[model samples]
Target: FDCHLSDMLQQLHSVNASKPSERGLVRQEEAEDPACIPIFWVSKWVDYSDKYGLGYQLCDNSVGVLFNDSTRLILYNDGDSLQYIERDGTESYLTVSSHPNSLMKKITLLKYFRNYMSEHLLKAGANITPRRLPYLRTWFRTRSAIILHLSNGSVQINFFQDHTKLILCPLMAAVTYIDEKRDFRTYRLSLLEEYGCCKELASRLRYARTMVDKLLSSR
Candidate 1:
């Protein structure tokens, strides 16, 4: 998306590829090959599109595209989470394990995930606003997961490791959570129903009911 990445992608195609085995990366350069420097792929989707190996391997199942020695990107099939691989190796990125299983992690892809998922969030965010009360309180709740009580209402989004979606989850954690015993679901649901129905959620929470409707409809 930036000049650096754009140049890297060009660099990758500049090379002729070799036979890519299962669980293997596209052979732009060999391990001992100095040409295996900071390289980028065409698209995150392109990584998994090839029948053979033409991308970085995440774990055993998913393939990723390499950005540099430190960065690897892979979006799951379910449109759930985009992972950034931290390579563990005895030699180099080329020598690393191609297991593509637990050899990765992501808490918040933040700057990285934005390269791919930004369009989704931007499209969905159009109806939402900066002043939304739920988000306003969320400005400071980066701990484990966002759970907050505001003057308008209480909202809680949680985390679950290795199980989730891209919409509300991240890095193997639950994107959202509800307090089953404490009744946060019912409380928030009723409160939202009351507020949005009464138009208070908009005036008080600084959100548009239309946005809520859009989110629910997607569900």
Candidate 2:
């Protein structure tokens, strides 16, 4: 994991250096928005944490486009909180509370799903198809229903109102698929066992596992 993280950081540095002029421009812009600094820092932090055991917490209520060393955005709703910690053990807390708009939330969910689908398709050695819309619509409608219920003023809101938590469901679902499949060889066996009613989940998990195998084998 450390080596993987080191490789990622090296890649990031090489990519940034390869486009020095663009990086300089980005740096200038980053200076203007303190939030951007922590975001960039968090990117590096993720690499470091991947290799090490250090982990960072991302806040549910605070929103920012980027992160840096000085960015401090934090929010509190109930007992949950979000913050980012660097690989070297530096920590910054977000101070503001915000949420992504409905459109942005939808886009984010779709992007996560697309990546998940692509990885799954590649693993399965099958051509990627465009059957994602139906699932997206179903998920979006479910989300809308929940939101409407929250706004109806009839029920008390709980942690379910946290959009970040809602967004995490699909992401965690993808992770769960990866865990179940284990490896490409076992993935097919696992898929076969769960086919029919569990076809959608099974297919995606098999594909993702196979894709990972293909990528690793190529190198």
Candidate 3:
């Protein structure tokens, strides 16, 4: 198993040091606390799938590309170490000093992505510790939205046509919604699920829950 999320969950659980009560009051209380929120998501991205691939830089500063060929290359935050994942889901570790001849181009592209993100794009403006690297776990597109699930158990759902977005941190039990105006509003899932929300937000949350369940069951 990819241990990024696993390790984070372990750390969070240890620090919190309590189980959910019968009323789920503990979880709900923590969800409402601003200090408990985590800032982890894609800070910048470039889509050049017409030629090569899609490049993304996480808020943690790690860069990656999902190439047109279906493989992926990720350059870690330190910039020297990297990870290459095959279509069959096998992962290989490499470094700046050593890599296979076949993956040389991918490595170069990864660096280009890193540079492009730093030079052209604006930061996502959220800060957190770079203790763990959260790579993409999986992604899928519905008719209405593009969804990306990261290794740290955060799901980002973007609706291209409507110009809205949703970011769900399951571990944090929080959901952030970006409306058409690009304004950000965050709500605890418990609040939304039990108290109800707008029709538009409700629908997106349903889709996100379905996709997350599908990913978990398949795993």
What TM-score would every model get versus the actual structure? 0.17, 0.19, 0.65
TM-score of 2: 0.19
Question: Which one is best on lDDT?
Answer: 3
Candidate 1 structure, TM-score to reference: 0.17
Off by over 4 Å in 1: 1-41, 44-73, 81-84, 89-105, 110-219
Model 3 bad stretches (over 4 Å): 1-31, 125-131, 140-144, 161-163, 178-186, 195-200, 206-219
Instruction: lDDT for model 2, please.
Output: 0.23
In order, the Cα lDDT scores of the candidates are 0.24, 0.23, 0.68
lDDT of 1 by residue, 1-219 (tens): 131222222222221121112122322112221221111111122222222222322112233443334344444433344544445412212212343444443212322443443343212112221221111111112323222211122222222232111121111111111122221111122222222222211121222122222223332
Q: Return the top candidate by TM-score.
A: 3
lDDT order of candidates, top first: 3, 1, 2
Worst 10 residues of 1 by lDDT: 132-141
RMSD of each: 24.2, 22.3, 7.2
